[PDB]
Ligand binder design. Sequence first.
Ligand SMILES: Nc1nc2c(ncn2[C@@H]2O[C@H](COP(=O)(O)OP(=O)(O)CP(=O)(O)O)[C@@H](O)[C@H]2O)c(=O)[nH]1
Ligand SMILES: [Mg+2]
Length: 257
Amino acid sequence: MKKLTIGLIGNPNSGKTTLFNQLTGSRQRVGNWAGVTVERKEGQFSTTDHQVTLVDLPGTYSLTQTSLDEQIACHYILSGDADLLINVVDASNLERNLYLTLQLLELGIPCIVALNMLDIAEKQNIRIEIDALSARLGCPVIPLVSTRGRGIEALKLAIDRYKANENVELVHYAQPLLNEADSLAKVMPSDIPLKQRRWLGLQMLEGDIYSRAYAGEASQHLDAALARLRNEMDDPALHIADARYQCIAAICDVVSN
Ligand SMILES: Nc1nc2c(ncn2[C@@H]2O[C@H](COP(=O)(O)OP(=O)(O)CP(=O)(O)O)[C@@H](O)[C@H]2O)c(=O)[nH]1
Ligand SMILES: [Mg+2]
């Protein structure tokens, strides 16, 4: 049969594999990603409604000198093979972990946040306003202690209610950057979802060399775009990052305490 394919993505050491085992138990296979010795492992588990297959992706800080783990990750996310994702976030490092989170949401891939290691966050004396965070990201947030199995049943419930992310505003990029992002997006392949073309546009404009491969003909116009921005603005590349951290930092002030 056709199964619901879920991608488990998060930062290094965010309790990702512990969650994988807690879901899939024995029902798992190990192999390797195409043309690269890096291991690929995926599993099987059942919610009330769905037969799930879970691909354990490699830990990555962002989707942009890199590593294979980064790259294999970003590839899988932009493939369409997964019906949704499970972002595994270390609660004791929200601000660090949420950079990857924002990127996934700017692609507009449906996902649930698995807020993990709150027992460490508690010990570090930090609490997260879960439902505040839920609103800001515009997607589910489910509390977890992966080592203890807390809210695994709560996570499975959230899977059966998988739904398009609330098209809420996240980062607030300067008007020109969006114009140019969108401008490049226009001359990319029409089959790729608009939202992803806008994201691929920004990453190109920031300086991601890999993203140009998806951009098609847009890779040409990059020089024209960047030249224009330089007149209107100092280090467009750097402005992009600033908008992201500003956003995360604003969110974290409200959500964490
Ligand atoms: N103390 C504590 N540890 C946790 C919790 N959830 C997961 N962990 C731990 O985090 C450690 C990280 O291992 P793992 O679960 O494999 O994370 P990972 O993301 O797979 C690490 P990599 O990405 O390198 O494979 C584990 O020893 C596990 O016990 C928690 O709520 N509290
Ligand atoms: Mg792991």
